[PDB]
Amino acid sequence: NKPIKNIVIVGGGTAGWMAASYLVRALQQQANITLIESAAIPRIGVGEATIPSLQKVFFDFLGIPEREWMPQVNGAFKAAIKFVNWRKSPDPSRDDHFYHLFGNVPNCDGVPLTHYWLRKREQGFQQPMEYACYPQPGALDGKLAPCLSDGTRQMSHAWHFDAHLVADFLKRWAVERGVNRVVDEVVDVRLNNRGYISNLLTKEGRTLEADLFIDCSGMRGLLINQALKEPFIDMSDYLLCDSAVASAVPNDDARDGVEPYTSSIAMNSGWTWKIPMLGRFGSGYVFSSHFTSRDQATADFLKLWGLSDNQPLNQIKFRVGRNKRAWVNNCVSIGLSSCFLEPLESTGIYFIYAALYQLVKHFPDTSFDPRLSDAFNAEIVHMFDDCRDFVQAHYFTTSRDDTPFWLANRHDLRLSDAIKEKVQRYKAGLPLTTTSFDDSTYYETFDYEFKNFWLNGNYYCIFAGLGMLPDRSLPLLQHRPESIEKAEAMFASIRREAERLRTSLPTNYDYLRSLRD
Amino acid sequence: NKPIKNIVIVGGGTAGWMAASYLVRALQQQANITLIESAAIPRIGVGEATIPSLQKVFFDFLGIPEREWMPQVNGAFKAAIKFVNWRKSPDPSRDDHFYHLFGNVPNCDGVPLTHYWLRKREQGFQQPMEYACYPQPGALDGKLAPCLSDGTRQMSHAWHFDAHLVADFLKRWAVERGVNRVVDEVVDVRLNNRGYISNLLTKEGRTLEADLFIDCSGMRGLLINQALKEPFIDMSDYLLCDSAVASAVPNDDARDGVEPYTSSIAMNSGWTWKIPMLGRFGSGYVFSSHFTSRDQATADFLKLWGLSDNQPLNQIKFRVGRNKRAWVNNCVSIGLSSCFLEPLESTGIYFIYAALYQLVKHFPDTSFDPRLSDAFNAEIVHMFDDCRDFVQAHYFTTSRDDTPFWLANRHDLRLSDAIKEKVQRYKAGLPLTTTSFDDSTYYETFDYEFKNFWLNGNYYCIFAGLGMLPDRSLPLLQHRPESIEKAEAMFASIRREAERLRTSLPTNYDYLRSLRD
Numbered sequence A, B: 001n002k003p004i005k006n007i008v009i010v011g012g013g014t015a016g017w018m019a020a021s022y023l024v025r026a027l028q029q030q031a032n033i034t035l036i037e038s039a040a041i042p043r044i045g046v047g048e049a050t051i052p053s054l055q056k057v058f059f060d061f062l063g064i065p066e067r068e069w070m071p072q073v074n075g076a077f078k079a080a081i082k083f084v085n086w087r088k089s090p091d092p093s094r095d096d097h098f099y100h101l102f103g104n105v106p107n108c109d110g111v112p113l114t115h116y117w118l119r120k121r122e123q124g125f126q127q128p129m130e131y132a133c134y135p136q137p138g139a140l141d142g143k144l145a146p147c148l149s150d151g152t153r154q155m156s157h158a159w160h161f162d163a164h165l166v167a168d169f170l171k172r173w174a175v176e177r178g179v180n181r182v183v184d185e186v187v188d189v190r191l192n193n194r195g196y197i198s199n200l201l202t203k204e205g206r207t208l209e210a211d212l213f214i215d216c217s218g219m220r221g222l223l224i225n226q227a228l229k230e231p232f233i234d235m236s237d238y239l240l241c242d243s244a245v246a247s248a249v250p251n252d253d254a255r256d257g258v259e260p261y262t263s264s265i266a267m268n269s270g271w272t273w274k275i276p277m278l279g280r281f282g283s284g285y286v287f288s289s290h291f292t293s294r295d296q297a298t299a300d301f302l303k304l305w306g307l308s309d310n311q312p313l314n315q316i317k318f319r320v321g322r323n324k325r326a327w328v329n330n331c332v333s334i335g336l337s338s339c340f341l342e343p344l345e346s347t348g349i350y351f352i353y354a355a356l357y358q359l360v361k362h363f364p365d366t367s368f369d370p371r372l373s374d375a376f377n378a379e380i381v382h383m384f385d386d387c388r389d390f391v392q393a394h395y396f397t398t399s400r401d402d403t404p405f406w407l408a409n410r411h412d413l414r415l416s417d418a419i420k421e422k423v424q425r426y427k428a429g430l431p432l433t434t435t436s437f438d439d440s441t442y443y444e445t446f447d448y449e450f451k452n453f454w455l456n457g458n459y460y461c462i463f464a465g466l467g468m469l470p471d472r473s474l475p476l477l478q479h480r481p482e483s484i485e486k487a488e489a490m491f492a493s494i495r496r497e498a499e500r501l502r503t504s505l506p507t508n509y510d511y512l513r514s515l516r517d
């Protein structure tokens, strides 16, 4: 069979330029790549938060080190997401926060420290799980950098950056490596009688042909949904939010520091992200139009940050869900054209480079063997539905009951069998997926991470943070007092590391400044 | 001169039964009224939306309160029309909606709040005009009722109802009051040598005579057009749509609520109405056959609502325009026999009862003084052409350029001198017609409303919603800082009212249910 020679990517947002760059790198020879993007249709870039696989799967693949791309996108550091006011109905006299940290919780004799922590909690231990089981949360409270001043990494972390700048950076990178860029707008898509894409007709009268089409057109799914008619599976029965109101808010970094984490601040009818970088933070109130109006939600977002009726706002709507199939015939959807999940756990850009990784892993020839696309499609469904369930578990496990929105989340959601099963194991006191890999191994082994994306520590951060704990500690521990004492020594080491970080790390603001404004 | 004694109405649709009922009520003595309607020729009833004068001019005249007629027609509430995707080319990531609300915008020192809002917008104020100037749009977003649970009206509103049921209700009402109903079909119309209608010959061999004939035969204009040869002024040079594909779509009211407004959803080659009531919504894609085929437009309508190729559809065509004269000799046209304008601003049923009001105001004797019919005809021309221009202003002011249809609307329409003049005043920053009347006064003074049917607030809802704003705020305001501060207090009161409505109104679904399924 003839190899794919010509590839056309529709879309110049983060997805299209990630696609262009990943494919140009992956396809060393024989491929001609063209990207068409409209000057008239804006990209989606709100201020974006990411996870460690961005470097390991995406930039490392391109051969671009962190120090090369970070400054060009005004990158900042992200060590966690901090959930605020999620646990029960907010009270301004009470500090309700918890962290979801990157990285694996250590095991002690085959049992994760989360489980020894729970046994202590049964005996009256007061410290929250993540402060007991991870060395870094107090450092995040102190707004400390993830690295020593000399750049030596001290905790697993990822990035916050200007999403437009990321698209721009990759545009430059891809074009320089032979990617053909066309600034124009696709107006019609012709299919042959068999249902394959023949060509794209553009506003300026260009006819684009290719062996392979990558739909990066964003939520409109110009090829996959509109031309190819692939059903979008609306998952608004699983998750209620459908809207965001977003802006950048200036930050007084010299006075207030730069928080080395994304915050998720539960609101009345959704939650507000906060994504700090030097000089400002991206923020957006993700809300459900069924429970609040855009105008009301806008009042709230402005009130939250003391912002004026004059502050210009990025008003957004979205459909939650995914295509029935991500790749149909000769078209692969990547990015917002493929699926969307609210940004509660920073999975959006992950879905782009994870899908691209899988595309290259299942790369077709011009015959388009359906066995390849079937296998690819199955990977995408696992990836998405697994993240959807994880996000949904933040909502159905909450103890908040103060608004219609929170009550709906507690009572009215449709839950997959898979998430019910995980919750059941957790409640029984069983660990979820654990590994004896350290973080380096995990984050360097994407075939492992892709299929084991949420580990025991991830579930525990969320469920413990939200105040849903197992019915009991692991029965096995009752037989293992030596192991319990071994775990005590491990908790002691974590505390020692935390105290060392406290006095060793520069502030995030100082470190970012030393990398340079 | 001898009074009119015998009246024959041809047609049993909404127009004929409104005519029968209005005339039987108006003509207390000396009139004998017969209505002939064919069992073989269907009525036009799609699911219909109305305006407040329906109660004030029509049902109040009959002496029928809202609570008497509403339940019998499965009525629902309408507080606005919500225009979706009209402002620029649709993007599924963007919420493009605006409301056209019933009721007058308040004045502050002789200047409408729309104009203070514009001055704020010049200074960076971000809130849309209708959310600033009216207390109810956020309540409509929350699908709230127009009344408190005890029925106390909280905003100006009108109705959605089953149009067949309305015709049926009035049929029963009119017949009970002495209207003679004949189920038969007129097959020939005899004119005397002078051109007056002598008689109607029917299929069953009846010969109908009368002093006065009311043509309610619908678009065929059996008497006015076909027998009397009155020219129809085709206005397809002003407005491009000529077709609709319509259906009822089931609604999940318990899950999704019942929207207390009509929606106008701009499509590729026209727009789709949505008219909610309990259990379902009437919908129709109004389109231009010049830009799309009925088959294509049907695909779109089905796609819009996720409907099946098995869904039976009300396929419609129409001519836009009006007779050169509505009343000729002894025949008065009322309803679709007189004129048609696409339902963009819910004027169709208005044209019926407004025309009937004017008929009674110009009521003839058997001599048919042409001074009476001339005066009546002039009122009808003003009424129609004024609404035509208002509707047309939705089309020529749009910024959409994504289809041939939208481009034609921006560039290819013939505009009246009257509408050019209004647009010019608006662009100069001048208010259009304002009144210091409150809504109660306006809607109780039909001689005022009939001649001042679109006020400043109506034009501003549409032009601001579509994104065409004046070149500048009113120069006068530069001299009136105290007035500007007074307006601020008024905007503050509106916001307070909006927040009170948010927590005080029942949902529209709940309220309608309490009135009863």
Ligand SMILES: Cc1cc2nc3c(=O)[nH]c(=O)nc-3n(C[C@H](O)[C@H](O)[C@H](O)COP(=O)(O)OP(=O)(O)OC[C@H]3O[C@@H](n4cnc5c(N)ncnc54)[C@H](O)[C@@H]3O)c2cc1C
Binding pocket: A010, A011, A012, A013, A014, A015, A016, A036, A037, A038, A039, A040, A041, A042, A043, A044, A045, A046, A047, A048, A049, A050, A163, A184, A185, A186, A187, A216, A217, A218, A219, A220, A222, A244, A284, A316, A318, A334, A335, A336, A337, A343, A346, A347, A348, A349, A350, A352
């Ligand atoms: C509210 C919100 C918050 C988010 N937060 C995060 C986060 O914190 N972290 C994270 O990782 N991800 C986040 N995401 C996801 C992230 O923004 C997207 O995954 C990412 O930016 C890629 O978008 P995209 O390129 O698929 O689509 P878009 O940005 O919508 O780009 C679409 C491109 O296609 C072009 N186009 C469309 N139609 C045509 C046509 N007819 N002809 C030519 N060009 C066309 C447009 O011009 C544009 O270039 C968030 C998303 C949303 C909506």
Ligand SMILES: Cc1cc2nc3c(=O)[nH]c(=O)nc-3n(C[C@H](O)[C@H](O)[C@H](O)COP(=O)(O)OP(=O)(O)OC[C@H]3O[C@@H](n4cnc5c(N)ncnc54)[C@H](O)[C@@H]3O)c2cc1C
Binding pocket: B010, B011, B012, B013, B014, B015, B016, B036, B037, B038, B039, B040, B041, B042, B043, B044, B045, B046, B047, B048, B049, B050, B163, B184, B185, B186, B187, B216, B217, B218, B219, B220, B222, B244, B284, B316, B318, B334, B335, B336, B337, B343, B346, B347, B348, B349, B350, B352
């Ligand atoms: C697509 C569309 C959407 C609309 N939407 C709205 C809206 O949202 N709101 C609104 O207020 N209005 C709306 N209208 C207008 C509204 O439907 C009409 O104004 C109204 O229902 C009255 O119609 P009619 O009685 O004039 O004619 P028809 O309903 O066509 O009735 C004609 C009557 O005359 C009879 N007839 C015809 N010829 C003969 C004959 N030879 N002998 C005996 N009987 C005869 C028929 O049997 C029938 O009884 C819309 C109209 C259309 C076409």
Ligand SMILES: N[C@@H](Cc1c[nH]c2ccccc12)C(=O)O
Binding pocket: A051, A052, A053, A080, A081, A100, A101, A102, A103, A345, A346, A347, A449, A452, A453, A454, A458
């Ligand atoms: N395996 C992913 C899990 C993840 C996604 N979003 C997160 C946010 C916070 C912590 C972990 C995550 C990671 O460690 O990167």
Ligand SMILES: N[C@@H](Cc1c[nH]c2ccccc12)C(=O)O
Binding pocket: B051, B052, B053, B080, B081, B100, B101, B102, B103, B345, B346, B347, B449, B452, B453, B454, B458
């Ligand atoms: N004077 C009419 C104007 C009107 C017609 N159709 C409308 C639709 C929405 C708002 C106002 C209107 C009214 O207030 O009833």
Ligand SMILES: [Cl-]
Binding pocket: A341, A342, A343, A344, A345, A346, A347, A348, A349
């Ligand atoms: Cl995300």
Ligand SMILES: [Cl-]
Binding pocket: B341, B342, B343, B344, B345, B346, B347, B348, B349
């Ligand atoms: Cl109408």
